[model samples]
Target: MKGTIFAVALNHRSQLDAWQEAFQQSPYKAPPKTAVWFIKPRNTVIGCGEPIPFPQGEKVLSGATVALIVGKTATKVREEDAAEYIAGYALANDVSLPEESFYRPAIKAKCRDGFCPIGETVALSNVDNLTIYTEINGRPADHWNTADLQRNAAQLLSALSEFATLNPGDAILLGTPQARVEIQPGDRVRVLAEGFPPLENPVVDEREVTTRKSFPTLPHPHGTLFALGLNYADHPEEPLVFLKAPNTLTGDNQTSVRPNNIEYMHYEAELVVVIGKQARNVSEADAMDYVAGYTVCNDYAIRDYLENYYRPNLRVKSRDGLTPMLSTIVPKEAIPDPHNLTLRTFVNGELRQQGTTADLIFSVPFLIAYLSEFMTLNPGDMIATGTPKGLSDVVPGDEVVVEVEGVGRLVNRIVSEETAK
Candidate 1:
């Protein structure tokens, strides 16, 4: 199924207790007041019996959990009505590298290829008290009860729908226990919950890996679109960063859907930096060397759905077709002073937003250096430098145009939900 696996972290009692003291310090001054949501994009999902790739020198942890499969369109749903939206349940393993901190999204630790292996779906009354068990090489490794989850399925669904509109096939992976099972390259891991069909997969060294649906298993076949928030102009608050899956991307002149009844949808003009080669632990001094070219994109946001400390949630910025980017690339050399270029947005011939890259809080090199410090930046990966301060709503039939001097210009139309399809 072509669905998004929206997962939660720190929603289990064990995880909280394990890091109780850590939660009192630095970024985690307190436990999360809202759900700690993260996305497991298409590249991360693998079917049962598939091989889970293990990178060299990196340890893989098995997070046995369950998922609540969304059956219909869900937006602004209440906990009381969540059950009506769930079609079934499944056993899932939230495979990942050990999380080191809560400061940033664990893209490197969790979003690798075949990291999320899901089981067959089965109808269930409720998973609140279900026992999920795991086995490695035919021997029991770990087990956890959904009863220990800090948030139930209904509550998680309700919390998520507050911002994201969950469509059919989309699922929420229930939180996992703090106790993770370590699996090696040669081991076979299987997760089973009472009523659901077991999910079994083998762990393989990186070289033996296979692509998902014929898609390349590299960092990402479509390449991850890394975007920065609050990275431009006067505002310097949190380092708000987010990712947009390939589905959100569309060619220039495409149309972006503006969901019905939302009063606050805005267009953002941004400069996109496309990476030429693999980058990890790159320094700002040498970061520009990895840039292949520059393009432009309109990072549209449905502001009505914004919430959580990290306003960069997928619902607000990652909806399908929301990102209209130019297909043409301007060689890095074509733009001598990328930092000095101006960015502007137009709606039906009227200029709505304007700013210059000189005001960028974090320069292109700094952003590449910061991300490469933890995650590997791969070819085709595009980094959308954040938008400037000017933002205004666009309505249906409005022709939106975003341009970055010396890079490229992108044009897309806005459509209402009624005619978007």
Candidate 2:
């Protein structure tokens, strides 16, 4: 999945029927009124004939579905113009773990390595009425038609484009029925439709399968920086996933500019996770093994420039040299339990904020395994776990230093907006 793999859930009539009663329970008072979207990142993608790595002790399902491949850049494209952006169609096996409740973050259940197998393509774009069949070991186990889908390809494209822009190689999977075929390590599963190329893959135990391919056919953007917004005790039932761009980076002992007339600029003391080896579907127990060490970062936030368009907005969150992270990494062996460390922030010389990593809403291993599922965490990639409940304002001329217990500290001086000029 070099390009993003966007998928919709509960769009099939069968899925809606199965969840009709469950929608009235706790956490969900009603069914979704809008599109239920989820991303299947690069690690979940494997080409035809590649072995599907089945995790032990978990049941896997073969969800036969169709894929609409995008041909060009599309942002807020109209429903009527959907055909112009679609290049072709493919048979995709949207594999997953049997979902208990669709209300939770489905990343871990659906994003295991080799869970998405997309087959050869052809320009057969208009297939709303086509039937998709799934076979387990050469026997037809389940079949469904796209006609049962509540949202067609055009509607899905229009809904997704309203927020996320799609590139040429991007793909979207039309919803799958609730009746999925059970697949195991020994089964050879296939997804078929009338006109498209058949998609097939042999299920193999994860322990025996090759988890990664060499270098990507196309280069991925540099190490992706993942950050959590409110990851402290108020971890809010769920963690906020925020991504930072490359330009926001600065080494320790740097200057972070304080824009003139800004309301607030605060330094976020975080225990950053440093990924050593490439990771995917890493279990919480073994997730620690994939980590190289831990580090600290002054995840500075310009709290004034934010709105509904805020979450991960490029301009507000990623200013040049706004964040200073320690270049040094404290091996995991040294910071034995990164979760128990103390997190403190100092302005000039006095302590301005105090907290403990022990109050982490999401721990180091959990966040690592949680993210490595949908996306690939390559070496050098970092995750800034959320800051605790201590935030205060910073003005120019203030020296801000953020520190973690065992890992070292980072120092940065706040400069006026005009200082850099």
Candidate 3:
């Protein structure tokens, strides 16, 4: 339940057929050659009984689908080997507002508070032919079968894991139909599947959402946490691209543990570019349009665990609670000059590291275009555009505060092994 939720767009045969002619037109040019991937981040995650807040006046749609939960680490896994990696399946509602365009990320339309409601997972031998149904106020509103999907669960897992490593607890939502049931405020929506438990929620107006409850689980990083190492010219030439596990993610003011018997533990102050839409084969000139906004990430690294293999492997970068990220996103309009902002890191009360985004070797737009060329970049997926030159070690009891001008600042405390437990 607490993991990355990756969903696909235009994956149902009906949708592909419905948009076939449009794909041949101006914007699309052609049908998607790969899976149109999107991420449902922690903000959208909710349990079966939670309320689904309806954005005031927005047209909300209820998408009933199944989720494939990962039980083991998956990377470049073949379709034949996918079943072994999958632990179970669950019913999910890929809630969203009407999607008007495919050219940009749909953060405003889909990535809202309590947008996705997932049911408890259960072991299922086969779901390729299962029927998913959506009901409103106890009446069946719409239904779809997994057989209508273009790609099965195994195919989706292999396609995504080919580029991004998916770890245990990560989930991939099966495709939904082109036709979705429109939901209204005060309506009780429910997602039902044969083998999984029914996932039900009440749609409430945002203004009326008072006691909204969050999922009772730890925060899971959305999709892949694409990181850039040596992105500053003063730092290095060749770009060091790496991925972090979802378990490493923690919210602001959380405590990160300084591992036992570790010497060099450093904090990295970074600016994160959050993708707002679906982008593939995007041009740099138009890449900025794909960005929804910016946020802050404190990329803490344990240099003592570094090895030649994978340079900065998970042992050093993906430790639990190592990365503390801020969830508040500053709209791109607010920050007219992202490249010129200042980045600083403070240990306790003393300023330890400082630099500016002006020093980045790879601009934000260029990174977006570069990544989109190879894979689909969807809303909620973020790029932690590297840090600056100042690096220092810190120990337990030290309060680390990393700030990015115009973006936001993050505050974290270093804890010991005993304290973390």
Point to the candidate with the largest lDDT: 1
Each model's TM-score? 0.72, 0.69, 0.59
**Alpha-carbon error at 191 in model 3, in Å?**
1.1
Order of the predicted models by lDDT, top scorer first = 1, 3, 2
Model 3's TM-score against the true structure:
0.59
Ranked by TM-score from best down, the candidates are 1, 2, 3
Would you list the C-alpha lDDT of every candidate in the order shown? Answer: 0.82, 0.78, 0.81
User: What RMSD does each model have against the real structure?
Assistant: 5.6, 7.2, 12.7
Candidate 1 residue-wise lDDT, 1-421, digit = tens? 3577889888989888998888777665665666778887665788898888888788899988899999998877898988899999888889999976765667778877778998887878788689999999999999889899888999999988765677888889999888898999999999987888889999999777643333343432256788888877655553557787556778878898888898989999999998887776699999999988898989999887664423466677777788898888788998897899999999999998899999988888988998776555767788899989989989999999999988888999999878865
Which ranges in model 1 have alpha carbons more than 4 Å from their true place?
A: 210-224, 229-241, 245-267, 273-295, 300-341, 345-382, 388-401, 406-421
Q: Report the lDDT tens digits of candidate 3 across residue range 1-421.
A: 7777877777899988887887787666666766666677666788888899877766899988999999998876899989999999989999988866664445556666788898898988769789899999999999989998998999999887764568788899987888999999999999998877799999988778764333332222355477887887654443456656566788999999887887889999999988876676699899989888899999999887654333455556766678899988898999998999999999988998889989999999888877665345666778999999889999989999999998998999999989866
**Candidate 3 error regions (>4 Å):** 211-421
lDDT of 3: 0.81
Spell out the clash pairs found in candidate 1.
Answer: none
Shift in Å, residue 418, candidate 1: 16
Off by over 4 Å in 2: 214-230, 234-274, 279-358, 365-377, 380-384, 390-421
